[PDB]
Design a protein around this ligand. Structure first.
Ligand SMILES: Nc1ncnc2c1ncn2[C@@H]1O[C@H](COP(=O)(O)OP(=O)(O)OP(O)(O)=S)[C@@H](O)[C@H]1O
Ligand SMILES: [Mg+2]
Lengths: 147, 164
């Protein structure tokens, strides 16, 4: 069940349609902000800009929920059975891409201590290459995992 | 623009004739002729015995359902909630379409009362709609409002104009 749900959410993130939609809304925000700066008519322009901002917030919040569910369910599927063990490689890629997004790091902090470390044992070339002393949360999780 | 795109659509529909399944069903599009004279004027072929989709649908909606909203009331109600959040827009749209019922099935019961002819013409409508839907998805065709779709009330089959 957990692998099903995690693969579903992952597939929803890396969706060509959804990425095109996010790119289109981003270019719209950029162009409308450039137009508003050109002016400073202004009232309707600002109102359209604010509506674009609200649409973009909605889209980004949807993507953030998908990311939370993806990471959490990957970690729960690794801790449950041994049928799906290349979920460790996919979780690792997905987590190293989002090392700054504090959402991902909170979910990982919550669920990382229940995975047997034998799932990550063969990924020490990739883990020990990202080690640093930066006092962030990503590093406090990564160093503890390598330890 | 309209002339070039009409030519492209005609060429692709000609490609459709080379395959057994689409040729067996005569899947294709209906063409018209655009002739640009200058950069500001042209001659367009007036398709013979059609009627615009909106010009059939707006009188029929009040002829068959006299208690529903008008077309203009629905348009205005949807245009007022154009600068609002998506939740309110979808709520207004559901509220409007709960008071607006489709009437297109009558276009065939009132131009073709003979069941043999009625069945053949309704199948022509469905097939030409399917062909132009796929062909206009593949080529990104847009601006498909009611005034660019004509209903041919002799053969049943839709004609798409203004393909620019
Ligand atoms: N080539 C054509 N053959 C037959 N009917 C046509 C043709 N072109 C347009 N029409 C119809 O005749 C009318 C002419 O429409 P126009 O006023 O030229 O453009 P329009 O599409 O009505 O204006 P907008 O911008 O779409 S509101 C409309 O009701 C069309 O459905
Ligand atoms: Mg037109």
């Amino acid at each position: 069940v957990f692998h099903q749900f995690a693969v579903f959410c992952d597939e929803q993130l890396q969706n060509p349609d959804s990425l095109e939609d996010l790119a289109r809304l981003q270019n719209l925000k950029k162009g409308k902000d450039e137009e508003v700066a050109q002016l400073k008519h202004l009232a309707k322009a600002k109102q359209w800009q604010e509506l674009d901002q609200q649409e973009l917030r909605r889209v980004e919040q949807t993507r953030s929920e998908f990311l939370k569910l993806c990471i959490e369910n990957y970690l729960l599927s690794l801790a449950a059975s041994d049928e799906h063990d290349n979920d460790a490689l996919r979780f690792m890629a997905l987590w190293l891409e989002k090392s700054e997004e504090e959402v991902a790091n909170e979910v990982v902090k919550k669920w990382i201590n229940k995975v047997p470390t034998r799932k990550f044992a063969l990924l020490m070339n990739q883990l020990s290459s990202r080690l640093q002393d930066h006092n962030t949360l990503f590093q406090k999780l990564l160093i503890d995992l390598v330890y | 623009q309209d002339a070039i795109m009409e030519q492209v659509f005609a060429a692709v529909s000609e490609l459709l004739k080379l395959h057994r399944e689409t040729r067996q069903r005569n899947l294709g599009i209906r063409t018209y002729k655009v002739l640009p004279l200058t950069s500001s004027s042209g001659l367009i072929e007036f398709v013979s015995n059609t009627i615009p989709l909106h010009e059939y649908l707006m009188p029929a909606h009040e002829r068959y359902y006299p208690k529903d909203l008008k077309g203009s009331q629905c348009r205005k109600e949807i245009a007022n909630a154009q600068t609002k959040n998506t939740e309110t827009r979808i709520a207004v749209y559901r509220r409007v379409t709960e008071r607006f019922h489709p009437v297109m099935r009558y276009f065939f019961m009132e131009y073709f009362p003979d069941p043999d002819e009625w069945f053949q013409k309704r199948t022509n409508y469905t097939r030409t709609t399917a062909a132009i839907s796929m062909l206009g998805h593949v080529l990104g065709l847009g601006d498909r409002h009611g005034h660019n779709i004509l209903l041919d009330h002799k053969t049943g089959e839709v004609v798409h104009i203004d393909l620019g």
